[PDB]
Design an enzyme around this catalytic site. Structure first.
Site, PDB file in Angstrom:
ATOM      1  N   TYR A  81       1.781   2.971  -3.257  1.00 23.38           N
ATOM      2  CA  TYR A  81       0.731   3.821  -3.849  1.00 23.38           C
ATOM      3  C   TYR A  81       0.823   5.266  -3.362  1.00 23.38           C
ATOM      4  CZ  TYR A  81      -1.443  -0.130  -6.202  1.00 23.38           C
ATOM      5  OH  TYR A  81      -1.712  -1.188  -7.020  1.00 23.38           O
TER       6      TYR A  81
ATOM      7  N   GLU B  88      -4.389  -8.961  -2.048  1.00 25.98           N
ATOM      8  CA  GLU B  88      -5.135  -7.712  -2.204  1.00 25.98           C
ATOM      9  C   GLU B  88      -6.590  -8.028  -2.026  1.00 25.98           C
ATOM     10  OE1 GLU B  88      -5.167  -6.119  -6.731  1.00 25.98           O
ATOM     11  OE2 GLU B  88      -3.142  -6.424  -5.912  1.00 25.98           O
TER      12      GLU B  88
ATOM     13  N   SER C 190       0.835  -1.217   0.000  1.00 29.16           N
ATOM     14  CA  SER C 190       0.000   0.000   0.000  1.00 29.16           C
ATOM     15  C   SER C 190       0.884   1.289   0.000  1.00 29.16           C
ATOM     16  CB  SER C 190      -0.920  -0.012   1.211  1.00 29.16           C
ATOM     17  OG  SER C 190      -2.038  -0.863   1.010  1.00 29.16           O
TER      18      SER C 190
END
Ligand SMILES: CCc1cc2ncc(CN3CCN(c4ccc(C(=O)NC)nc4)CC3)cc2[nH]c1=O
Length: 350
Positions: A246, A327, A243
Site C-alpha cells: 500500500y 486483514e 501493508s
C-alpha cells in the site's frame, strides 16, 4: 535552524513535499491544469464519491453502456482527468468504481496536507521544518536502535514478509515513536478491550501529513460501500509486506512509510469473502478477513500489554477463502491508537 533529530527533519521534508503530491495526482491521471492541488476541496471529492455511488447502483442493476455513459461522464466533470480531446474511459463496472473510490480516499489525505501548508502563518525567522512539524500536533521521537521495542519491531518486519511479495525486500531505516494529540484520550474506552493487537497500515508518503494530523479515518458517507471489500472502515494487516504494498513505492521512488497501530479488535466478525457492510453485527467490534496464511500464533509476543503477531507465516487451516493473508477492519476511528512510524527502504529484485 531546527534542533529536531535529523531523521525527524527528513520525515517532515518527505511528507510535506508538494512535488510528491503533484506526482501522486498525475499517477491518478488527474488533469492538473483543470484541477491543481490548490483547487482540491472536500465538497468536490464528496460530490465525486456520490456520483461513484450512482454509477455503482446503475452497474449493479444491469444498465447498458449507453445508459451508464451520462453517469460515468458526470464523475469526470467533477474530477477532471488528463485525456486531451478524446473520450475518457467508461466507468461501467465494479473494478472501475473501486479504483476511483481508492483514488478519492487518497485525495482526501492530499487535501489535508495541502490545507496545512496553506492555512498557517509565514515567519522567515523560523525553520520551515519546525513550522511544519508543529502542524502535525504529533510528538515524534526516534526509537533507539539498541532498545527492546526496536528489536521487537525489526523482528516483526523480518518475520512477516510474505513469500508471494518477494519482488522486493525491506530494510528499516528509522523507527519513530508517535503520539497524536488527543488520541490516547479518544482511545480510553477501548484501552482495556480484549484482543488488542499491534498491526500494520501502509500508505503512500503523500498521505502521512493527513494521517499524522487527522489520524486514520474512514471514507465519508458519500463513498460507495461496495468500493471496499469489507465496507468502509480502517484496514490493517499482520504481514508487513501486505501493508508495504500500500506504500506504492517503485525503483524510481524506493522509500516508503508504514505505521504500527494498537487496534482494539475485541470480538472479531470472521469473514472469508467480500461483505460490503455498513455496520457490524451486535456484539462484534471488528472484522477479521481470514487469510490462508497467518503469522505462527505460538510466536505471538507482548509489547506494553499489546499482542504482537510476529511469528513466521504458516497455514491458518482456513479453506476456500478469498484472502491469502489476514486483514483486520475497525468501523470506529476511536478503536486505533497509532504507536510507531517506520521509514523503509524497498530493495527491488526485479
Ligand atoms: C490490509 C492492509 C492495508 C489496507 C489499506 N487499505 C487502504 C489504504 C488507503 N487509504 C485508505 C484510507 N484513506 C482515507 C483518507 C481520508 C479519509 C477521510 O478524510 N475520511 C473522512 N478517509 C479515508 C486514505 C487511503 C491503505 C491500506 N493500508 C494497509 O496497510
Amino acid at each position: 535552524k531546527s534542533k529536531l533529530p535529523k531523521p525527524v527533519q527528513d520525515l517532515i521534508k518527505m511528507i510535506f513535499d508538494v512535488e510528491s503530491m503533484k506526482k501522486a495526482m498525475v499517477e491518478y491521471e488527474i488533469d492538473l491544469q483543470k484541477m491543481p492541488l490548490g483547487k482540491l476541496s472536500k465538497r468536490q471529492i464528496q460530490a465525486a464519491y456520490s456520483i461513484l455511488s450512482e454509477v455503482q447502483q446503475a452497474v449493479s442493476q444491469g444498465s447498458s453502456d449507453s445508459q451508464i455513459l451520462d453517469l460515468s461522464n458526470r464523475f469526470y466533470t467533477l474530477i477532471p482527468h488528463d485525456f486531451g480531446m478524446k473520450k475518457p474511459p467508461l466507468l461501467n463496472n465494479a473494478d472501475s468504481v473501486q479504483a476511483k473510490a481508492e483514488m478519492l480516499d487518497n485525495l482526501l489525505d492530499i487535501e489535508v496536507a495541502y490545507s496545512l501548508l496553506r492555512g498557517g502563518s509565514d515567519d522567515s525567522s523560523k525553520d520551515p521544518i519546525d513550522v511544519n512539524y508543529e502542524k502535525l500536533k504529533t510528538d515524534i521521537k526516534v526509537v533507539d536502535r539498541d532498545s527492546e521495542e526496536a528489536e521487537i519491531i525489526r523482528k516483526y518486519v523480518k518475520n512477516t514478509h510474505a513469500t508471494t511479495h518477494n519482488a522486493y525486500d525491506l530494510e528499516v531505516i528509522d523507527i519513530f515513536k508517535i503520539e497524536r494529540e488527543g488520541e490516547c484520550q479518544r482511545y480510553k474506552p477501548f484501552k482495556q478491550l480484549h484482543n488488542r493487537r499491534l498491526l500494520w497500515h501502509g500508505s503512500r508518503t503523500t498521505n502521512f501529513a493527513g494521517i499524522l494530523s487527522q489520524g486514520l479515518r474512514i471514507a465519508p458517507p458519500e463513498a460507495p460501500v461496495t468500493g471496499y471489500m469489507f465496507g468502509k472502515g480502517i484496514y490493517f494487516a499482520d504481514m508487513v509486506s501486505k501493508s508495504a504494498n500500500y506504500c506504492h513505492t517503485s525503483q524510481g521512488d524506493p522509500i516508503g512509510l508504514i505505521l504500527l497501530g494498537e487496534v482494539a479488535l475485541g470480538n472479531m466478525y470472521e469473514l472469508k469473502h467480500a461483505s460490503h457492510i455498513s455496520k457490524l453485527p451486535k456484539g462484534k467490534h471488528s472484522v477479521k478477513g481470514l487469510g490462508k496464511t497467518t503469522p505462527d500464533p505460538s510466536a505471538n509476543i507482548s509489547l506494553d500489554g499489546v499482542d504482537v503477531p510476529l511469528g513466521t507465516g504458516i497455514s491458518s487451516g482456513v479453506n476456500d477463502t478469498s484472502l491469502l493473508y489476514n486483514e483486520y477492519i475497525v468501523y470506529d476511528i476511536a478503536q486505533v491508537n497509532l504507536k510507531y512510524l517506520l521509514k523503509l527502504k524497498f530493495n527491488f529484485k526485479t
